[model samples]
Target chain A: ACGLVASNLNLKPGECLRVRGEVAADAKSFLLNLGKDDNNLCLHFNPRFNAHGDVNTIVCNSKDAGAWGAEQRESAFPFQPGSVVEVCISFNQTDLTIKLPDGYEFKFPNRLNLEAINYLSAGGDFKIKCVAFE
Target chain B: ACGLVASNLNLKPGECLRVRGEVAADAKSFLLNLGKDDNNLCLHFNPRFNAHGDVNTIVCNSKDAGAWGAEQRESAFPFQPGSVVEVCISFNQTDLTIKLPDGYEFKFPNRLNLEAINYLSAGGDFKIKCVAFE
Candidate 1:
């Protein structure tokens, strides 16, 4: 369940982070983190197939000072293990908009209130195929 | 109007070619071509603002043996000059689906009947910001 980290990214407004990958068939969950560092996360995107007794839910949140914000959950989970998926995330001053692989749109608040983020890390039981910022 | 061509692309089924660029404010039209060469085009995507007295129309066609096929016109135009746009194109055996910047979907037939294309060219009145295949 080890993933890759793309550091020193210039992900700003009007730009998006596009990720393409495949998940293991027996995978449990995965996390895509964006921010300055591990503790100061601007966007913590977690798609859990089974987490806290919940099945197929996407949890979106942020962290500051090592304290996590309130979790926002979305039930529209289109991820299937053993299949390829493409996710695109873009942020502005107000909200972070994510376009799922199935063309579903999910948005979360920019609670960290950052204009730009430089660190991106993906971890969990999936295999990353390609990651780009454009 | 000049464009940069991305050559030697390995665009296959289940894979997509993503393009992000900006159109000049005074742009009249643009073309995004996918093919084996300039003469043998598999996809000729031309958005004409005033071509042949047509405004805001997308004309799709193909060429084989240096002969142009019948044109397919789509009237839903969402492009604006002087603004940035992102386009995603994916091809399968049946169709070539394009997701425009405004989330509009455009489908053109793979009339050339080719399984893969190696050349891509974008020209005629826009500036390419970034291009990637995933």
Candidate 2:
């Protein structure tokens, strides 16, 4: 369970950001965030096995001024502890789509409304292997 | 022009490896590599604007026992200095396809013939933003 971030990525619309990681054997959850910075986020994707009163749920939300927006949940539960998890985040004109492993897909609004974003972060109970935007 | 490598990545065949980076304004070239380790590589992709007696060339090769194989060259050069470059590498049964920005694509053989690769590295004159497998 660690946290890391990379800067100046320059993620624009029509680009797909692919992230690969391995879930810890005793992991409770993990998260992937993208936006201008930590204070503001266009997407906050959290997959929980058992955390925050949620079990095997994917919680999606946005943040502004360090305050979180409404939460959206998905119950696919394709993530397995001690295994690898791969996801792709693609941005559209209005909203962004995230495709997870095992054909699970979800959509969230572009709350930040910016042309390009440069901050990417991952934290919680997983090991991030690779994070690519192409 | 620096080199960095990650281990235990588990880059399996049938997966697409997407890498995004920023080319240095004074860069002469950059290279992306994948295989078991630095001594053995199934793919070594080098794009040069002016380096190694080559200009605007994409050179592909493999290394085994610290010896490089026959070189293959591509003429398309879509990478720009001081700008972002995105490339997707997809492995098939016997060959791997590399798709660069601006619709440029090329192919190279899987000389190592391994089921999965555990090491990934990028070096030379670019700042890697994200290296993702999905």
Candidate 3:
């Protein structure tokens, strides 16, 4: 299985960055990691295929930088089965910017940033052919 | 001096509607009313000009529907001075959907909707020419 990872990505306090990626599996879950030192922040997108081969979009995040843990779970923005669609992820000092394919956007804060590395990793039984920065 | 008024717009348990309006005043703060009866939900937008004749966009809404009152205020998506920009406002049973001119969106909740009228009024020393339905 192909994987995508970004180690030691420098992220500032006020600066923001966007991550875009396409899934290469019919129905697989993907996790994007962010941190300064260890893996603390993770955004999970689990695309599951129904009997009709339709991939559903699932977005998740931890607001407190893994402190209070992830609480909000929005059940919308489903994707096509085995289709390569880009997911946008942005990070700021206080919040995480997530834009779903259905134009639905949600914001959550990075509750922890002391000695963080801003690293990213994607590995959860799937093929990720391309990862782009926006 | 024309006015827009919806005295008793009965909102269901989980229904939603989009409120679109063309700011009337060249330079004034406009308030959109929302509630079941006594007018609790209010969304405000104040456009200002900075010598260059550019209107800065400002959007404000009271989450809590008017209970804990308004707390989160984001400063982005400025409007043009005296120019016409349509503001999209949607009310769900839980949260409020606001789409700014600069593609920046924000969400707040109607914390109190026990006896809200869902009525809307435009009043704040501005000429709100046209409010559309979307």
Candidate 4:
């Protein structure tokens, strides 16, 4: 079963979007997208637990004018298949900094270079316990 | 004025200690220490807002048999005077990973090489809002 939830998010500079969720044991993949809408995503954060056969990766990319940018991948896979994770993402003019559940961090360029984003969407193979801007 | 609060912390490998606090506007420094006791610190995390002449640094050190180990410094000063910050520290046999408030991360050696620690203390120039093991 797949599901998606989109919400209005007034994420500003110096603030962060915090999410707490749990992935299903048999989950294949999930994504957290931030943008103005479905087609203009500023951040496409997809975590694939088993993309093909036991290969886990976190892919980050941006979409502008309905075209996706270069994909950035991080090999530090800290999330377990059926475990809870908390994530915090903060953005500045140059980068989007992500703090993963296992105290690992990854940085990606703020390709869209926007100070605030008004939309957030989360979907697939996971249960979101809470989402807050702080 | 300097004060320390020590608590029993049954921290295991893969577990994390999370702390939230605010630095005093006129603060000079503060520290979070984890270990067996005051004299056998495994991790000494000190953040100096202005150590001497407006220099900011985060210092990590260890103490074994009452002898201080080498100091590791990270110049990514994310804490501001009077600002609230959240920190998470997780440890393994080789390293202690720290996630700072600004989404920045730093790693220090787990010099003691212990699987679990029994004590934790936070003190100096800050007001601790919360502390929990997760």
TM-scores, all candidates, are: 0.51, 0.57, 0.39, 0.49
Candidate with more favorable, higher TM-score: 2 or 3: 2
The Cα error of candidate 1 at residue A65, in Å, is: 1.6
- Clashing residue pairs in candidate 4, if any? none
Q: Which number leads on TM-score?
A: 2
The residue-by-residue lDDT of candidate 3 on B58-90, one tens digit each, is 545453434635545555755544555555666
Q: Candidate 3's fnat?
A: 0.00
On residues A52-79, what C-alpha lDDT tens digit does candidate 4 reach at each position? 4436888889998789999888888888
Location of the lowest summed lDDT over 10 successive residues in candidate 3 chain B = B45-54
Tens digit per residue, CA lDDT, model 2, B37-69: 889998999998899999999999999989999
As a whole number from 0 to 100, the lDDT of residue B116 in candidate 2 is 76
| Residue A6, candidate 1: alpha-carbon lDDT | 44
RMSD to the hidden true structure, all candidates: 10.7, 8.9, 19.5, 15.0
Q: List the residue pairs that clash in candidate 1.
A: none
Quality of candidate 2's docking, in CAPRI categories? incorrect
What DockQ results do all the predictions give, each relative to the true complex? 0.03, 0.17, 0.01, 0.01
Relative to the real complex, the DockQ score for model 1 comes to 0.03
Sort by lDDT, best first.
Answer: 2, 1, 4, 3
Model 4 residue-pair collision total: 0
Residue-wise C-alpha lDDT for candidate 4, range B7-108, written one tens digit per residue: 345578888778787799898898888888778888999988877443698888999989999988898888889988889988899988999988998898
Q: Write the per-residue lDDT of candidate 2 for residues A1-134, one digit (tens) a residue.
A: 13556555667789888888889999998999888888888999999999999999999999998999999899888999999889999987689999989987889988778678777778889877677657
Each candidate's number of clashing pairs is: 0, 0, 25, 0
A1-134: candidate 3 lDDT, tens digit per residue: 12434443454444444434455555455555556423355434444444223345454554343453654555675565456565666656556677767787776566564333345555544434333332
